Design an enzyme around this catalytic site. Structure first.
Site, PDB file in Angstrom:
ATOM      1  N   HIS A   1       5.679  56.625 125.160  1.00 27.71           N
ATOM      2  CA  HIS A   1       4.282  57.036 124.500  1.00 27.71           C
ATOM      3  C   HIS A   1       3.543  57.752 125.384  1.00 27.71           C
ATOM      4  O   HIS A   1       2.783  58.793 124.995  1.00 27.71           O
ATOM      5  CB  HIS A   1       3.532  55.930 123.875  1.00 27.71           C
ATOM      6  CG  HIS A   1       2.305  56.120 123.171  1.00 27.71           C
ATOM      7  ND1 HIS A   1       2.403  56.963 122.277  1.00 27.71           N
ATOM      8  CD2 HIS A   1       1.273  55.826 123.373  1.00 27.71           C
ATOM      9  CE1 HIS A   1       1.235  57.188 121.676  1.00 27.71           C
ATOM     10  NE2 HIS A   1       0.325  56.771 122.419  1.00 27.71           N
TER      11      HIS A   1
ATOM     12  N   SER B   1      -1.901  59.969 120.112  1.00 29.43           N
ATOM     13  CA  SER B   1      -2.214  58.576 120.187  1.00 29.43           C
ATOM     14  C   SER B   1      -3.229  58.088 119.466  1.00 29.43           C
ATOM     15  O   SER B   1      -3.456  58.786 118.593  1.00 29.43           O
ATOM     16  CB  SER B   1      -2.346  57.990 121.548  1.00 29.43           C
ATOM     17  OG  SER B   1      -2.301  56.709 121.974  1.00 29.43           O
TER      18      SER B   1
ATOM     19  N   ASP C   1       9.200  56.900 122.292  1.00 30.91           N
ATOM     20  CA  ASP C   1       8.020  56.056 122.132  1.00 30.91           C
ATOM     21  C   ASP C   1       8.340  54.950 121.584  1.00 30.91           C
ATOM     22  O   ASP C   1       8.947  54.665 120.287  1.00 30.91           O
ATOM     23  CB  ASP C   1       7.128  56.937 121.131  1.00 30.91           C
ATOM     24  CG  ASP C   1       5.642  56.579 121.001  1.00 30.91           C
ATOM     25  OD1 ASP C   1       5.618  55.482 121.299  1.00 30.91           O
ATOM     26  OD2 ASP C   1       4.879  57.535 120.898  1.00 30.91           O
TER      27      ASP C   1
END
EC number: 2.3.1.31
Lengths: 374, 366
Positions: free
Chosen positions: A344, A151, A314
């Protein structure tokens, strides 16, 4: 001289002095908070830099307590024989520049004795790398075996690999793209706008006033949390079910609504709105191609061996972005798919699958460190 | 006599009296705003009901003019030789119950002479169908040839078809699901929370105070707009490019950010926050299965010929939802896949492809 690492699991505050930022602003007297697990090898060749995401901190692993509200954000990842095997590696995590858990951020005191607040500079991901590099240099560490992150931590890892390829042996770049996308900037800038709309924002100078824009950050966090979820899993989990015995037909809550309210509240108890703003803007700035002839040229000339992980479901960093990283980075052998329904947030919840990517990255780094002489 | 239809392009205000809503609340003295295009047939059998989405109104087609600051939200869909060919069909559109463009909603005056505001009842999609059906009946129209709609308009069309299959010959259900999903409720309820967080909301009773929660609605609309976009198309259009000569590295805007701020502002100039709340809650209520043994039972019960359209890149009503509708509605011959990069907003942008599905629906109605 060089400053010592803190005791295992404990916070060390590393004072790195002034930092010249990418936009030309000088940020004086920066402190970077550090936690580590595992011994530093005498040759300092065994450092694994663990790079946290938007609301993460240096607390990668271990239980809640001793200043930590919850268990580590990657609890279990570092330990004897764990994916980051602390019998061999020194796992170091910083609190990112801009953070609110020990590093210099908008809540920190400026030279004038008042919180930085609205005076806090615009920072980039590159500034976050530069601060972490300086913290390592102050600890006597100039080379890293591996960088690992998902991320925003994947953005940090990717910039570290591209910016300092001579000083990292391998990396894990998980659930991120080469640059911020229009959809990412759209949600990030609108989350920021929800914080700045809150009358307690006080232009960013709310710190130490007894009022804070928690309500606007809770709204931002509810929207962000949806971007982190797998659509199908979220519907399988909550559908349109009411919360407990409430009646949505006469104004009660739905289960997914109550859940989002709870997520907002949890963040407001542990995280600073101004930090949310600064780090969200740093995510919007993400672009490995800036000043480097664009993303394709920047990735094609980066020689570092890299494991690229992408999560099937995601919605915020969709898998096309990790396919693009895996095609362009010559040291990537092919995309590693994380086959997950958890969106995610799979970068946090799929501990087994993520741990296998980490272990592969470090087995690679150990082979390369055996052939790297410094 | 019946309430007369308004002249082509003019708004008619149809007073339907009290409405008993699904939650049992009786909403008194309801007015539904109506526009129509094309002649009503002597047998009253040629009506095509055009059902607007969250921020739409009765202004389906036509240019910006007096009482309409912009072109019709489905401009060109109805007219001579158009997908709804008004040489043969009578296109009718209401402003939905809860709306702000002529129909009873939160901004309308309650019996006590003050805006409904926080006293406005929670309405459902089924209540919107009941208001429209009552307005048509007041105009002397007791059945329709077809219902067409995308998005919230699709939910209205689907509930119309399932609730009243004897009184509609065919339908278009475009870019919607059989019930609200967790993601839709999550974004809808959070959009509403953004409006209610704005200190100008005043508990819902801001109407007439000189203050309104436009800032919170602009936030809600920016997030909703992202849900309406195709992710890849949005990145192709804007990427991380700056707005004009601004520098995001020193606090400037990105192009996508500037575009979202613009979308918010446009809605703030034309749309009421209280209506946004009421209609967003109506969308969260959407469930054709409620009181009917669940979605599968309810859809299988409906024999009406139906064109089901879904957009390949839709992020808000993903195409799995329209595949479910196509599989379970016995009058559906298969999912009509709208292969479009434009996300949910395809239901507005893809005029040619949506026109084609409307022509197919009106063939089934004959």
């Amino acid at each position: 001289a060089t400053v010592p690492l803190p005791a295992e699991g404990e916070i060390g505050l590393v004072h790195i002095g002034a930092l010249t930022l990418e936009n030309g602003t000088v940020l004086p007297d920066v402190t970077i908070a550090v936690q580590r697990w595992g011994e530093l090898a005498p040759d300092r060749g065994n450092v694994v830099m663990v790079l946290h995401a938007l609301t993460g901190d240096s607390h990668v692993t271990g239980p809640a307590g001793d200043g930590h509200p919850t268990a580590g954000w990657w609890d279990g990842v570092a330990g004897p024989g764990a994916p980051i095997d602390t019998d061999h590696w020194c796992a170091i995590a910083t609190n990112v520049l801009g953070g609110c858990r020990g590093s210099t951020g908008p809540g920190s005191l400026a030279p004038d004795g008042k919180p930085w607040g609205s005076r806090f500079p615009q920072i980039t991901i590159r500034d976050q790398v530069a601060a972490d590099r300086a913290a390592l240099a102050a600890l006597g560490i100039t080379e890293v075996a591996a960088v690992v992150g998902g991320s925003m931590g994947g953005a940090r890892a990717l910039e570290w690999l591209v910016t300092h390829p001579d000083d990292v042996r391998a990396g894990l770049v998980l659930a991120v793209g080469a640059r911020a996308t229009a959809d990412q900037i759209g949600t990030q800038s609108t989350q920021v706008a929800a914080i700045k709309a809150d009358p307690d924002w006080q232009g960013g100078d709310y710190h130490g006033t007894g009022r804070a824009p928690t309500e606007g950050m809770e709204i931002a966090r509810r929207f962000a949390h949806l971007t982190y979820r797998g659509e199908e899993e979220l519907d399988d989990r909550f559908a349109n079910t009411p919360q407990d015995d409430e009646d949505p037909l006469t104004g009660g809550r739905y289960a997914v609504q109550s859940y989002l309210e709870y997520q907002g509240g949890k963040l407001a108890r542990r995280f600073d709105p101004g930090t949310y703003v600064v780090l969200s803007d740093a995510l919007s700035s993400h672009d490995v191609g800036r000043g480097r002839g664009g993303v394709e040229a920047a990735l094609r000339s980066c020689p570092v061996p890299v494991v690229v992980g992408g999560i099937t479901s995601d919605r915020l960093y969709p898998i096309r972005l990790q396919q693009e990283l895996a095609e362009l980075l010559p040291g990537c052998q092919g995309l590693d798919v994380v086959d997950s329904i958890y969106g995610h947030d799979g970068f946090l919840v799929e501990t087994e699958l993520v741990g296998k990517l980490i272990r592969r990255t470090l087995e690679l780094a150990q082979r390369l460190e055996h052939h790297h002489h410094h």
